A paper describes a structure:
Lipoprotein(a) (Lp(a)), an independent, causal cardiovascular risk factor, is a lipoprotein particle that is formed by the interaction of a low-density lipoprotein (LDL) particle and apolipoprotein(a) (apo(a)). Lp(a) is a lipoprotein particle that is formed by a two-step process involving interactions between a LDL particle and another protein, apo(a). The goal of our research was to develop a potent and selective orally delivered small-molecule therapeutic to inhibit the formation of Lp(a) by blocking the first interaction between apo(a) and apoB to reduce the circulating levels of Lp(a). In summary, we report the discovery and optimization of potent and selective small-molecule inhibitors of Lp(a) formation by exploiting the repeated KIV domain structure of apo(a) through compound multivalency.
Numbering used by the authors:
A (entry chain A), C (entry chain C): 0 to 79
B (entry chain B): 0 to 78
Amino acid sequence: DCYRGDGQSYRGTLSTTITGRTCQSWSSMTPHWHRRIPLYYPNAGLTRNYCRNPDAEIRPWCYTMDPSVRWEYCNLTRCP
Amino acid sequence: DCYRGDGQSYRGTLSTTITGRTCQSWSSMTPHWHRRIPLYYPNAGLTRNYCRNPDAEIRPWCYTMDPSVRWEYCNLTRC
Amino acid sequence: DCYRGDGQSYRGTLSTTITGRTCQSWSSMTPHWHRRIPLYYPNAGLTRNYCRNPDAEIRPWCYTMDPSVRWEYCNLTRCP
Ligand SMILES: O=C(O)[C@@H](Cc1cccc(CN(Cc2cccc(C[C@H](C(=O)O)[C@H]3CCNC3)c2)Cc2cccc(C[C@H](C(=O)O)[C@H]3CCNC3)c2)c1)[C@H]1CCNC1
């Protein structure tokens, strides 16, 4: 599994961060309250807890299930 | 008056930061808008402007009344 | 074109950050959702996308048109 460019187009199902943490669901505010919700980013594919890039970071990312770690990049490599 | 561990259990009355600033009230959104509110933290004892640790910081903290400084650790020692 | 004190009083028309990005409009909620609007800061001169200091930063600042970069200080030096 891989991403192209900055990964805004990435629509895979990876839900694990670079440090092995589980992604938080985009539709949950727990443990991290956020504004990266389907209502505000309807074309960004904010499904379940999948790694995404709704706000033009360098690569796909997610909020994490670890209360002490708000968000991280995903364990995902750049495409050949 | 002191905290144990990471101070998630702290329920004392200290309301002052490690720089001497006064804590903002948890129920207040001014000068700092936030979501450390009883709705998302029912167990956290978020009362008045008391130093608390709802969200697993390393020690009790509060939003500060200084508009320049969003939040700081509290002037509290470990038991 | 410069700021006095920490620039709370500043009402010039600069709309460019330190890294040369352009300010988002204060009334606009896109790309960054925020609280710094005419309602919650009534005397701050939150007009168009002009560099302001309503919330007691060290210097005037703005939210940026870059969706990733939330806010930056403006390219404005202090008055001599
Ligand atoms: O992470 C994000 O969601 C995204 C960035 C983002 C977007 C929108 C708003 C924020 C800011 N929030 C906190 C916050 C709320 C109100 C106001 C501010 C500060 C102001 C502002 O940024 O509007 C500035 C403006 C100029 N001087 C102050 C900050 C972020 C926030 C939201 C919830 C909790 C915290 C951390 C806690 C807090 O500050 O509660 C601290 C408090 C102690 N424990 C943790 C921080 C951040 C990134 C994710 C990947 N892409 C970008």
